[PDB]
Write a protein that binds this ligand. Structure first.
Ligand code: HEM
Ligand code: HEM
Lengths: 214, 214
């Protein structure tokens, strides 16, 4: 389609289904998820969102990203910090895993930010809009399954306190995405990078699932 | 005493006891606290920490604050945002109170930041170190009392995920405070401002208590 947002949606439909039908995620959806499992994804999200947001900050003033820069509304690093402190204790920093699939994702994010900032929007879209749209569904699953203490922390990641309405925000985001001017060369690269992002996720889930069964 | 940290501790002992004597806080300590009550302090903390951190950012490079600037370790705005979203729902932004005692506190903070940045450390000390040292306790009280859902959010404020050890951090903070070079003129102004900060708190508790009994 003409609009980037639509083109991304449709171009990635295959990999997104593959991504949502990864075993780990399938079991997540069906309600089967363990504490160790949850601790792992949260640790992954941290590494990922640290890298992503590091590179967003690097390129926030560039024309190729500035229009989709919404720091207050989207930033996840902090909430992840809050959550990991809960899940892993005060020395979470030192004791959280950093598996090869996490490195591979972190690595790509940095190579994009440093040398292809024009593609960064692919990852921003993939992650933020994804987690926004599939958050609140995951979240509910997690609390029923993980049978948590009434300690009032652990799931901050699944709430974007500065976005009153998701639907309004998604539209505004898409609008801004589609405002981005780019050559057809770049546009296809961006579409591919989005597929890449889904794969990096897919392989990460395969990796986590492998670890959890051993 | 010679060291600012000690001079502040001893100079404010009266007001601090008065502050911890306040009915609202007394009832908090002895376990008696309601949802409406809790929602109110959390809303206050938001307004306060927004103003404080706004002014910290304004003056972080100044000699009169830079040495006690620990953004990652201390910042509370975000966690408060997470918590209010939980306590007040997605439109917390629009529906949280902003009473006169909150305005009075917010007002002072901005007056200090804009025209007496040298005193800002009084408020930083009062708030951050206070909440740090009294946190894990108020947290526990709050969860037993408020009987909250296992929803994994609501109490992020009471956790500083980037401070592995409180005791180590308090020392480092005090060290930095005491490093700050200032004239005796300023030093007394700072000591007074700290007393001010405690009062602003005291009056706020009196105000909240008044509201809660109608
Ligand atoms: C159990 C896991 C997941 C669930 C239950 C889930 C659920 C959903 C739901 C219900 C939507 C709404 C469809 C729409 O309005 O477009 C959605 C959209 C989306 N999800 Fe997921 N999702 C999951 C995992 C993922 C993952 C892992 C990613 C990416 C790494 C992702 C990326 C997206 C994106 C980008 C959209 C928006 C598509 C668009 O409108 O452009 N999701 N998700
Ligand atoms: C509301 C305003 C309050 C402020 C501004 C405040 C401030 C402070 C400060 C600045 C310190 C120690 C810093 C120093 O060494 O001088 C402190 C210590 C402490 N506060 Fe509070 N506080 C407040 C309320 C409370 C409440 C309600 C409790 C309830 C249990 C509490 C419990 C403590 C405890 C246990 C300490 C001991 C830490 C220590 O001295 O080793 N505080 N407070």
């Amino acid at each position: 389609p003409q609009d980037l947002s639509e083109a991304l949606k449709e171009a990635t439909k295959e990999v997104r289904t593959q991504a949502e039908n990864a075993e780990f995620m399938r079991n997540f959806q069906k309600g089967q998820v363990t504490r160790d499992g949850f601790k792992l994804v949260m640790a992954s999200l941290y590494h990922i969102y640290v890298a992503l947001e590091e590179e967003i900050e690097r390129n926030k003033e560039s024309p190729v990203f500035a229009p989709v820069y919404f720091p207050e509304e989207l930033h996840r690093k902090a909430a992840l910090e809050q959550d990991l402190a809960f899940w892993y204790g005060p020395r979470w920093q030192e004791v959280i895993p950093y598996t090869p699939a996490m490195q591979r994702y972190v690595k790509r994010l940095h190579e994009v930010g440093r040398t292809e900032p024009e593609l960064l929007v692919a990852h921003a879209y993939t992650r933020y809009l994804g987690d926004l749209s599939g958050g609140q569904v995951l979240k509910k699953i997690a609390q029923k399954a993980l049978d948590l203490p009434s300690s009032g922390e652990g799931l901050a990641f699944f709430t974007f306190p500065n976005i009153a309405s998701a639907t309004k925000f998604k539209q505004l985001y898409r609008s801004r995405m589609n405002s981005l001017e780019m050559t057809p060369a770049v546009r296809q690269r961006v579409i591919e990078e989005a597929k890449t992002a889904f794969l990096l996720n897919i392989q990460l889930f395969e990796e986590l699932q492998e670890l959890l069964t051993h």
